[PDB]
Amino acid sequence: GFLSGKRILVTGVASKLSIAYGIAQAMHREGAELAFTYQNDKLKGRVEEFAAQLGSDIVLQCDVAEDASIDTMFAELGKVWPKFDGFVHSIGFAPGDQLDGDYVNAVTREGFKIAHDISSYSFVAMAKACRSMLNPGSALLTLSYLGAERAIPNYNVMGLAKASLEANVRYMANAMGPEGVRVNAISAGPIRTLAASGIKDFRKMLAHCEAVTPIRRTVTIEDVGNSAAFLCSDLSAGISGEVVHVDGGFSIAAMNE
Amino acid sequence: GFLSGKRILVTGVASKLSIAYGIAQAMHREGAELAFTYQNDKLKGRVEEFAAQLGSDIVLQCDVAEDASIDTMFAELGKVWPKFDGFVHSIGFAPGDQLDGDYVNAVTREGFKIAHDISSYSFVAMAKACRSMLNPGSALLTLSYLGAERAIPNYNVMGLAKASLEANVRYMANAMGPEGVRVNAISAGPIRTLAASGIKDFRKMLAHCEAVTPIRRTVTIEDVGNSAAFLCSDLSAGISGEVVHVDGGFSIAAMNE
Amino acid sequence: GFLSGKRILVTGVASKLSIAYGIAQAMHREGAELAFTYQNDKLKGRVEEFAAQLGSDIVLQCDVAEDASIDTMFAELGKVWPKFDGFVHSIGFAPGDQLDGDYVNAVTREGFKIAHDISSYSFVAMAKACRSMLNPGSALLTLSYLGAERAIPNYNVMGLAKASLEANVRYMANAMGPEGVRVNAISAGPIRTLAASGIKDFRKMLAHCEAVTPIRRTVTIEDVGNSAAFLCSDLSAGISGEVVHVDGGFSIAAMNE
């Protein structure tokens, strides 16, 4: 495939519904050698199966909430992979209470901090921890959401976190560009996952989205997976600091009433 | 003036170079009744001085780094201003080490945290606290910067914080609109302030914008002042959750070579 | 008023519902000396009436569809206003057939042409003609619409014309800045004007924005009027080549469901 000869790390695989699973399948199909990470123990088994299925025996625990965890993970990886070609950042979190009802009422200093820390800093934290291991032509990918561009009901603080994320890409793209490291982000529409079961009245969100979307259908972890694969391949050598919207063109329309 | 009868709380005045000083200046001119806060005891005296110059004697202290400091301040304000028409958020901060050299090499979890806390969270924090005190037709206003839109050397983390800031404006604007609260932001061009001091090659940064800026000059606190007075008046009763660029059209140009 | 001593040429007044009528209204209030043009003989009388109401007797004719009509008008203006401080461009047009149904099925080379000519080109056309007549500190201003930023049903071609318009503002702003000419645009929310009449389900379009708009109401010509007066005054001497959205923050929201 067009990913043949690429060693890529994939974070965030929690279920077969995970956007990361979609990205992995695609990259694997496209010839990429993979590695996986799992947040905690309660996902060791699950992630270990997916990896096996994807022909990968590199599965490591790590928690972005802790530097050490990030440092240790890249420590083990360096044993099998002293040098790879980027990783996929499919990480984001926010205390439930924060994602329901009035934003001004919901938001808290703690919640605000946690959301930005995991959903944003986590990205540069990893890059920072593996800067010297990256090969020339390497690529970093991260997932975002329209919430970073507009005020969406209930998304609340995740919105600010995503806005911070998206700027991180521009700041990361500019800094590592000279070394030959591209940094981009995919803005995917709403998908069928576990975390969304987290956001309030998510399911109506979807329905509206698929009725009013140009392509008239919501995006799959497949649509997102392929764009991701391409974005991490040399095929996109010319693109960096970009946030391509993979939401079947939902954000560019208005009043499709 | 078109600000007559209005009661506005101004924050961020640290010196005569302060942007807020320019804002308070214009606002007072257009006839609004002002209130001033000051971060700490080191600043108290001077703010009290400017306060007097502007016919004000309401000079409360407030360190947005603390929720106790914010509640107590608004509790003190309610004593004389049981109700008021908004406030100008002119605060921003990040450890010095953060604004120098490689963004990825310079950034840290702690720095990222503080920048986002003092610079982004504080805005809503202040809103949350005074929500009930705001009259219909009230207007909140904060200051941002291009760093939010594009990767600017040395600006680093502050850029992410501003991105989060600007998202905040939109989320705040959408939540309080129905109650009659407008929220906007002014993305200002650089101005030699005490803060600018900490920023590397700022003096050089100012020089580049000047020659390449459409209006062939950098903006003044007077420029920002007049705009904030407008954005904070009933004259802009149709503008909300907007980020108006007051940088003499620097951002809309390219390769002015 | 903050417009005192200023001499502004206002175009586009067709009725009391006209946005320009709102602009002229506010401008006159803030004390600017006005000049009015009228497209044709069908309109002459009414414009002359409004002109009188606003202490003006300078009512020239101008059909931006012709370069001869533009030169002659400014030639007529120079008679009494050898020098002035800018003009408000409030013109837009496109064959009716263009604003109904499938954009691709509705569009035509001729329609595309006329929309772009009357709506986009005319702005610079008028600038080219009065360039030498503008005092330093002058300000040009045009009206645009969201259609420029996102595909809005039925708006069709006008959207492309507005996109070109907004680009014009930026290119015009960068070219005249050095001479001291500021150029900006107001992207206004819908308002029931004679023109709106031609637009399908506009009445329905207004209803959607109202309920989903942050400030829970659509803007008024008064709203636009106050903003244009500002953008056309020395108060905004730091804003150029900018497109300030005066739509009550409708555009910065999403799924207000």
Add this chain to the structure above:
Amino acid sequence: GFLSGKRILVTGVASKLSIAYGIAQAMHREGAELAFTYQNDKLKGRVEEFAAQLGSDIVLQCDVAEDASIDTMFAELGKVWPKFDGFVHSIGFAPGDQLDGDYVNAVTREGFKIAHDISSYSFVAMAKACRSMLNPGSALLTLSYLGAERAIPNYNVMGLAKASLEANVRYMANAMGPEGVRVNAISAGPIRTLAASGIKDFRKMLAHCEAVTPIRRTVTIEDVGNSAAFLCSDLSAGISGEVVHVDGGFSIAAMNE
């Protein structure tokens, strides 16, 4: 390849330097069946060789300046291809005089009209002429430039034309989406071509661009070709109405002084 089983039309092949040549090579390599069009006779031979090299014997004359030419071209094509999967729009023109020196001075009603007609309308004109021939999952691609977003010296009117182009994509994406037709555009940085020899002081443009670009190098017709191939393949089924910047991240940086 990932384009296997796709019939695609490629317009704008004038030289081996042409961006279109780059897109063709890539698509061919990726398994796509191709067709070519040439503006006039003076390019019949050249384009006929490239096509042969690319294993294509479908080469037709056509001129977007004329509907009939567009109608006739799709007439012949329909004989061999009664149904294909999109076409590549690599068309744009503007009278030289328009692309040099002061924009306000340079721009003319004629020049303005011609630029928009060929550089913008040409796109929907073709789509309009081949709507019924397109298969489900088809994709339309068009090339744009940062000039559509910022005021670049000398680009002048091409800027407005590109801005109109980019809106056309959103309006075209929204209208044909429901039929299963994606419409996107690639915003490529400056490249080594014939038309650029057209724009004034183009070569300094480049140099600045490659010195200040994150990836620290200008994009090739290869980088642009691959992104184009991907954009026209099912791999990007989730993306539409998008304008991905293929300029090595130049637009997202600032003051890389």
